[PDB]
Structure formats: C-alpha cells, structure tokens
C-alpha cells in the first residue's frame, strides 16, 4: 500500500507501518518565495532521515522566518528555507511499508515485489542466479499521466544479469526525454522480479 500525501505547512503527517518499515518514495515542496513566485524545493533527504527503516515517524514543515515556540512538538519540524508564508504552499510526498529495504534478493524461484524511490541508485542483486523482470511500472499519481509501463525497457536492460539498476530519474531523463518537475521529482517505480537458477 502506498501512502500518497498532500500536506500544508504546519500540518503534521504521522506514518505507521502495521508490519515492515517505511520507505520514502519522493518528496516535493511548492511554495512562494520572497519574490512572490512559486519555487520548488527538495525534502526527500529530510523525510528519509526521519522515516526510512523505521516502523513509524512524524513530521511537519515550517518556514525559515517564524516565531520560534518552545514545545516538544518541535523535534518533528523540518524547515524549508526560501519559502514565505502563504496558503499556496504545499508538500506532496509518498511512502510505503516494506518488510525489507534491501534490494539483495536472497531466494531463487519466488517473486519479489517492492518499490524503488524517485532517485534510486541501488541495484537489485540476485544472491543466486540471474534476474528476470515480470513487471516494472512507473507511478506518478499526482500528475495527469499516472502510470507508465516500463517493463520492456527494464527487461532488456536487466534480464539474465546478476544485478539490475533501476533508476527512475535516469529512465525518465534519458529514455522518456522527460523535463516536467511533476514527473521528474515525484515518479517512483514498482517492480515484480524473480531470480532464476
């Protein structure tokens, strides 16, 4: 199950896995700056540090220039610099729960199913045998095109190799000639894969 969240500044997002641990798929900030133009900023690294590999986390976003309160709530804060206070501001982020965040596949002859982050650099590795891609899907549920099937591309670039690098950023930039921030900053992949022999 993927949590696709849209949150305002100030609003706390509280995540919890019934089983497994959290894996952050993407994060994007859209906010007015001091020049009253809509800017884009990153937040993936901050969310990963709070959430990845944990069964629960909680965070909220706030502005560079703020009246600083003293409160236990503050340990959950994430400051985004150039943003100025405005109702137009908004964070879109997705996480999912997985039993493991490792892409080393330990057993042969069983399907694995997992997600791959927006800017993944970690290869999928068969401990025993070689890769075989059943399905590789490019999800962008906040964009007008919500789904692209990239199975054939991943299949030709990974089948019968011991390891496979699925990098959604590189797929989009270099195979789909993608330039739109919606897709570049928020798309993530799901893969169904088996190790043979």
């Amino acid at each position, epitope marked *: 199950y993927v949590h696709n969240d849209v949150i305002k500044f100030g609003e706390e997002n509280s995540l919890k896995c019934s089983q497994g641990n959290l894996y952050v798929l993407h994060c994007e900030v859209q906010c007015l700056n001091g020049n009253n133009e809509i800017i884009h900023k990153r937040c993936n690294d901050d969310i990963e540090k709070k959430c990845n590999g944990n069964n629960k986390c909680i965070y909220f976003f706030e502005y560079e220039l703020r009246k600083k309160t003293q409160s236990f709530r503050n340990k959950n804060s994430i400051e985004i610099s150039e943003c100025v206070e405005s109702e137009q501001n908004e964070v879109k982020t997705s996480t999912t729960c997985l039993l493991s965040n490792s892409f080393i596949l330990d057993e042969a002859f069983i399907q694995y199913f997992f997600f791959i982050k927006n800017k993944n650099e970690e290869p999928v590795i068969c401990k025993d045998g070689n890769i075989n891609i059943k399905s590789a899907l490019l999800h962008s549920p906040f964009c*007008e095109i919500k789904l692209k099937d990239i199975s054939e591309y991943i299949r030709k670039k990974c089948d019968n190799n011991k390891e496979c690098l699925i990098d959604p950023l590189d797929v989009q930039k270099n195979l789909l000639n993608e330039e*739109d921030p919606c897709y570049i900053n928020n798309a993530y992949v799901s893969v169904n894969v088996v190790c043979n022999k």
Partner: antibody
Amino acid sequence: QVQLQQPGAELVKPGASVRLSCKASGYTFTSYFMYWVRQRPGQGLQSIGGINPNNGGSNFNERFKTKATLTVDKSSSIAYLQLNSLTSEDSAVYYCTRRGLGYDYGGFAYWGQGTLVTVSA
Amino acid sequence: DIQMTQTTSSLSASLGDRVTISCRASQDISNYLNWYQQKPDGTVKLLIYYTSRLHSGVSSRFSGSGSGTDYSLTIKNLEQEDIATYFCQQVNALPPTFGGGTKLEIKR
C-alpha cells in the same frame, strides 16, 4: 519554445467528417495529454476531451461522446481530432491545448490558434 | 460532467477599479479551478491555476480565491489591456469543464 500548430480553416460538406491536426513542437510530446476545445462564434469555450499519447486513452465531454474521436501520431508528435458527420451547428473554432505543468491541477497554458471549421455546401 | 456557472454574463467598470468575477461548481471541486482570459482576437491565456497560483508571467493584479464550490477572480487597478472575456474551468474531475464566461467592458 512550445508550439501547437493548427490550420486556419476547414470547409466541410454537411454530413461529411474532417480530421483536424495539431502539430506540436518544442517539448516532449509523450509527456502531456492533448486536449481539445470548441467555441461556436458568439459563445464560450466548451471542452471536447483529451488524450494520453502514451496509451491512446482519452476522456470525452458528454456532448462529444460520438461527435469526436481523438488519436495521436507519436512519431510525428501530431494530435488529431476527428469530427464525425458534421452539421451546420458544428461550425466553430476548434483549439488544441495542453497543460503548462504535468501536475493534475495544471491549467491549460498553451493553445493552438484554433481551426475555423465551416460546415456548408 | 461537473457544471460550472459564472453568474455575471457582462461587467462594466472604470479604469483603476477593482472587479470580481465569480464562479460556482455544481459540486465541491477541491480547489482545482483555473481562470482564463480571452481577448477580443480570440487568443486564450491561462491566468491562474489551482484556485490561486498565478500562471508564469501573469501580473500580480490578478488574484484568485475560493473553496468548496465557490471561487472568485479579482483584478486590481483595472487597465485598458483588460478588455476580455474571463472563463473559469474545473479540472478536479475529468473531463474538464468551463463556465460560460464573463465579458468585461471598460467605461469611458
């Protein structure tokens, strides 16, 4: 620069059909839906529908469920609006248009010039 | 198809004035509302998307507000260049749908 190029005009006999073209350039054609919009001479904008060039899937406004057929040619980055079995009441400007950003709340920032379809003998 | 309704058909205001154009959806559209300007020559320009986000290059004289079913375009310090027809559009549920438009005339 993003460009959507449409012919100025099409003259169509009553009861015939016509295929309108929208030739896109300056961006990656498969990264956006193409939408179409009608405007009869003294009236307002009316949405026709839109197509995902990646899978050919489309949505249609109710009034155009049969009047309109959307297709694309991905190779040449051209979107087509086929208008079926026209009557004089289909005389109108037909625009192609696309969202400025790919977010699902994006507005339609780029517009073709619009083709004036005249249905007449 | 969500029905969009622009109540004022036609508006007359003086230079420098402030005008409001309203739009109402037939069901909650969760702020997914856009505004367009069509000038007399037929050219359509996006002004505002997502209720209040200004399209790139649009003057800050234009602002948008609203929630639920009810939304408003505000134009401050009216200029001559503003003679146009203004249209809203929901994109909360596809297919998108337009309001019937509001014609703006400048007094002299």
